[PDB]
């Protein structure tokens, strides 16, 4: 007759590759605490334009 | 007659990082980050 079946090893090989890069993209996010001020209230000029 | 084709292999290989695999064995690699120091200023 007519049948259909999937190959586990070829599908697993592709998933192992994508899960590897999915780990590579979300791994160890930077941890920043006391930084600089980015939103300002009034004009300051030289230092503010550089910040 | 038979004619097999293949590549070379080392008994001990370095592990490197790739896009898909984090630890994959290769025949040879080099270090790009200088971490050692002589301790003296030339």
């Amino acid at each position, epitope marked *: 007759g007519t049948g259909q079946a999937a190959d586990l090893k070829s599908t697993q090989a592709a998933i192992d590759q994508i899960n590897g890069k999915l780990n590579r993209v979300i791994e*160890k996010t930077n941890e920043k605490f006391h930084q600089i001020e980015k939103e300002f209230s009034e004009v300051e000029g030289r230092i503010q334009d550089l910040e | 007659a038979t004619l097999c084709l293949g590549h070379h292999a080392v008994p001990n290989g370095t592990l490197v990082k790739t896009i898909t695999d984090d630890q994959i064995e290769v025949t040879n690699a080099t270090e790009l980050v200088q971490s050692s120091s002589t301790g003296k200023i030339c």
Partner: antibody
Amino acid sequence: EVQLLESGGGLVQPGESLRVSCAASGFTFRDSALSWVRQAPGKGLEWVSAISGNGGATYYADTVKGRFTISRDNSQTTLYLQMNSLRADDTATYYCAKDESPPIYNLMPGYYSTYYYMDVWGKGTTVTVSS
Amino acid sequence: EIVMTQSPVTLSVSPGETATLSCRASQSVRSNLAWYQQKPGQAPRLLIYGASTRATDIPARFSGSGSGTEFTLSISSLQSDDFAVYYCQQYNHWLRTFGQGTKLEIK
């Protein structure tokens, strides 16, 4: 309730075979991975192997790379581990452990996500290999 | 194929004080790291997974941190029933490995 029960084990002569069962009962639909972890009294934990979906694992530790083989019977919901060519150092309390992965991984529900952490541990079966 | 070394082998901490543990790991590891509390005569129990994300319905006194190589586990308010042994696992090398184990004492 996600508890599993380990059956089997016992005393065996070195060189013999022995398979340990793990009745996966509860929340586990058994489209998730399972693992075996052994520990000898007086030693720490050591991951043994893992199973995924159908025949996606094929994941064995270097200590048992050529001896242990992992079976899965989803129809009866039981995980197996055929321990052949047992040596003296194989004496340990073999734990059957659940396996969970971050939801970002495990794209297809059945196949293996190469990053698992064990959450629900079993009661454990003690296997002694001596004379 | 990726060894885990915990430090020290055993530590003595008075009840109430914070007990910081170590889980130094050769080669980088960040995504997956799980801590366990195996009380004597019992199976291990999951505490933290990933690095800092603690397991479900476990006390908030169990804190986790670390990145790549150096990992720590601090128990804020210590109780007399915390005399268990603690372990840490890792990803991946398609082969997860466990730690040696850290014994915790009271008083």
